[model samples]
Target: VVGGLGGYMLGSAMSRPLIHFGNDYEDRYYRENMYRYPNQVYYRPVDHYSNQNNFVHDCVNITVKQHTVTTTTKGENFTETDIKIMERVVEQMCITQYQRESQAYYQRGAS
Candidate 1:
């Protein structure tokens, strides 16, 4: 019984990350590559809502917003062009992941 319980716990922990790996990986990729550009594009997840009135709303909804203090001065200063590119990259990645997940859900007959 103890072994079974331990196995279940381990599997649960591992599965949670594995299930969300795509999102997590995309987030990390954005953060790591952000440094390559001049401006840092932070990953902020936005919540979206759809209403029957043919209106859609999207906004960044977080429990708490906090800034990280860093002593290291950044390398190259990011230009406006760099920030634009980063934004485009992040948007594309997130959209692609969403589409893929939607397809996967349909394939599995999951709503």
Candidate 2:
């Protein structure tokens, strides 16, 4: 059994210690040579959330208006009672639309 195979095994055994020592030396070198910096307190200099995401301010603002008109088809041709009803309907519709507009505005603000 003392042949070329034995020499190869012996050579590998010799190289194992050298490889182990080289790996340990590199590990120790990295550990000792590591550089560190001071703790960066409030290092992130960012803008205000509103400033960064500053969308059109006017777009989020809500507007309200009120008006009354005759409920006739073309010329004067309807009862005052029906006109009052139509005006009330329009006013209620405006109220609902205002609510919806505010909901959308608040949702956009949250986002």
Question: What's the count of clashing pairs in each model shown?
Answer: 2, 0
- The candidate scoring highest on TM-score is 1
lDDT per residue (tens digit) for residues 17-73 in model 1: 111224544555545555452121122212232121111111000000101112124
TM-score of each: 0.32, 0.30
| Model 2, residue pairs in steric clash | none
Highest lDDT: give the candidate number: 1
lDDT of each: 0.29, 0.26
Q: For residues 1-111, could you state the per-residue lDDT of candidate 2 as single tens digits? A: 323222111111001111112354444442342221111011001122222111112111111111111212334443454333333333333333334444655676796
- In candidate 1, the residue pairs with backbone N, CA or C atoms under 3 Å apart (3 or more residues apart, or in different chains) clash, namely 38-78, 39-78
TM-score of 2: 0.30
